[PDB]
């Protein structure tokens, strides 16, 4: 459920889940998929800023 929610959130603004997790891993971001799916589903501004940090890292 979290992965599907994260996949929808990343695809709304930019990249896919597979490139999102790689971006978070390269940026040393430890946020779990549970918290990420809650940010995506409940605060889209933060997830937009969170995708950018992953997008600039690749």
């Amino acid at each position: 459920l979290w992965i599907a929610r994260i996949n929808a959130g990343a695809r709304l603004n930019g990249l896919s889940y597979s490139r999102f997790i790689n971006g978070m891993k390269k940026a040393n971001i430890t946020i779990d998929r549970r918290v990420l799916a809650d940010i995506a589903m409940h605060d889209a501004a933060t997830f937009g800023a969170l995708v950018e940090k992953a997008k600039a890292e690749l």
């Binding site: 799916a37 995506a40 589903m41 409940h42």
Partner: protein, 142 residues
Amino acid sequence: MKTLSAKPAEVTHDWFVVDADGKTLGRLATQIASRLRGKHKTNYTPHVDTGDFIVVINAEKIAVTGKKAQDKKYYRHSGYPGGIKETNFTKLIAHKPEDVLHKAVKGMLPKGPLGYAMIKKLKLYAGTDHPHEAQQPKELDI
């Protein structure tokens, strides 16, 4: 902190138009199936329909590749002994144009009460016009 569901009363379904003129049958059906399920939404929960209403025009102008127009077979059994029937993609598109795309999408959805509910939101028409201007569906190239 908990992972919450979509609360059907709080979900809204958006209206879109897809012009299926010259697009590949299966390449488009996957896109429609995902939208009907609401996979593109961050509040997607597999037990709530969070999808969208998709209006498809030019359903007869949808295309298949290779030699599939003359060779894709649609079988059905009537329920009587020896009651097996078959028709072509091109013979079915000439007799029931919406049934070709409706049948690809139906097999790409879950098979159950929620699956029956989210195919009810696929309003597909043969021709360039649809009777849904009241819903003001936005154009969507998918």
